[PDB]
Structure formats: C-alpha cells, structure tokens
From a paper:
We have characterised the catalytic domain of the [name] protein biochemically and structurally. The atomic model shows the typical fold for a pseudouridine synthase from the TruA family.
Crystals of [name] D146A belong to space group P22121, and contain one molecule per asymmetric unit. The D146A mutated protein was further shown to behave as the WT enzyme in solution. As expected, no activity could be measured with D146A Δ[name] with the catalytic aspartate residue 146 mutated. Furthermore, we observe that the D146A mutation leads to a 10-fold decrease in the affinity of the enzyme for the full-length H7 substrate (Kd of 2.2 µM instead of 0.2 µM seen with the WT enzyme) clearly indicating that removing the catalytic aspartate destabilises the complex formation. The positioning of a sulphate group inside the active site of Δ[name] may be irrelevant for the enzymatic reaction per se, but clearly indicates that the active site cavity is not neutral, a property that was suggested to be important during the catalytic cycle.
Numbering used by the authors: 83 to 101, 108 to 348, 352 to 394
The structure:
Amino acid sequence: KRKIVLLMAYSGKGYHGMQQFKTIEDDLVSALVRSGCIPENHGEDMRKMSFQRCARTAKGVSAAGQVVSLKVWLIDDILEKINSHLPSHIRILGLKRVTGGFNSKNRCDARTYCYLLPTFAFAHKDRDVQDETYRLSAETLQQVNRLLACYKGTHNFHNFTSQKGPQDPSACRYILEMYCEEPFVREGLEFAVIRVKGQSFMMHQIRKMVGLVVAIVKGYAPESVLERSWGTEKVDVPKAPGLGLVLERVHFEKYNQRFGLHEPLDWAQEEGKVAAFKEEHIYPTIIGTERDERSMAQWLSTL
C-alpha cells in the first residue's frame, strides 16, 4: 500500500547473515508480521511485498546503516511498532516514504565499512611487546595508514577474492578512502577502527585487504607483496576474521544525478541514534567477543 525505505542497524553475533541460526531478516519479518505491517503470506514469500536489501552481510557481520525497501501497510507509529517486536541488538532507525518503482539494491552506489580489531594485530612479531599490554605507536599507526592508502584508487583486486581470474573485468574494484583511526582502551584492552569506502565490494575483499596489511605490519611479509598482489600471478592473501566487520553506510550520492523519491534520502536526524547504537550494541559486542573468546588472537597464530 505504501513503498518505503528503512534504515536499520544490528549486531551480527548470533545470526547467520542478513538473508544454521536465524538471520537478521527473520527477526524483521517476524516483527513486520506482529506489528501488522505485513500479512503472513508476505512473510512466507518476501517477493509479494517486493523486499530488497542493499547488502547481503555475511555471517557475524554487523551493520550501523543497512538499507532495505518494501511495500507495507503504513500503520500509525510504525517505527515504534516494528521496534517493539525486535530485540535490543536490532533497530529500525529511520523511515523514508518512496515511489513504488523504487529498488534500494539496484539504485544505491558506494558502501562504507568499518573494521574493529584489537591493536595487537599490528604488533611486530619480533621487536614489539607480545601480550595484551602492547600499545600502538604513532610510528606503526603511520605505517598502517600509508599501507592502507596504497589501496586507494582503482586496482585488479582478483587476489583479494576467489573464483575470479586476473583478466576478468569484474575483478577490478574502486576504493575511495581507507584508513585507521587513533586507538582506544576498553578495560585493559586496546582496539582500533579501520574505515573503508568502496564503490562496490567482492567476497572477502575487505577481510583480505585487512589481512594483508596485518601480515605486513606484523612482519610476516615485506611491503613488496602489496604491489605484487596486483600482478596477474596468484598470491595467497591472508583473510582476517569477519567478526569486527561492520556495514556503516549505504550511499546514494549519485542517485539524483541519475534519477531525481517522494522525499529526499539522507538520514541526518537519525545520526545521533546511529552513533548511539554503534556505541551501545555494535562495538561492545565485538569487544566482548575478543575479550572472552579471542577471535583475533586465534587467527593471528595461523599466520
């Protein structure tokens, strides 16, 4: 009855992707059914409400700004309703009324991800402290950033995914920005955040991009391998865990220079919520997982 676009956020842990455990969409559909937004048959076959997501986030991957689009009964106080049938770690942050022909998946352009990791993924395997007390130096952070900056621009990223040959056009991808933020300490443990904006991403690309920069900084490999990895010959690139991977923003920067959308598509009023959900549900869960289960310490021992 009224096609809409939802801005939503979630903690990835305990789910099996967006689309053996339940998925993010299972919780949402359940909430959509219970709120009265959609009929049961529409939940059984999501095509009937024309459901679309922008990012098929993988197992364990979180999101601060996932975007979906669908037809619903536009009930009173719809946001509160849907949210009242959802857990804490899943939130519908915003609603925008949109034209019926709209498809969020196809009409979006760039993507921004985040990677939250303990800082000992950057400790040199010989000259740095080898326990939890390690603290990222300004020199090393600088190395990390210069390395991440080498990714900027266009490249043949075939070595950062799989099942794609070097001559394959779809293997080429475009990175807009990539860097690491200044570290912070939560209860004796230090972490840091990596941000990456790309026009589009392939399977494991970000995880492999981060895995390689980790392998270099730690000193398991020389800087040379970064430029080598773009050559046609195959190079086994280390794939970092997906635990700290966070979909941050789905962009529509090129939407108007291509279309002209019953109301504009920016989430400016929801920004305080966006940050809040990140600080309350996304970040502490990742931190809690590294503290108790040691995802990163385990993956590091495999290099």
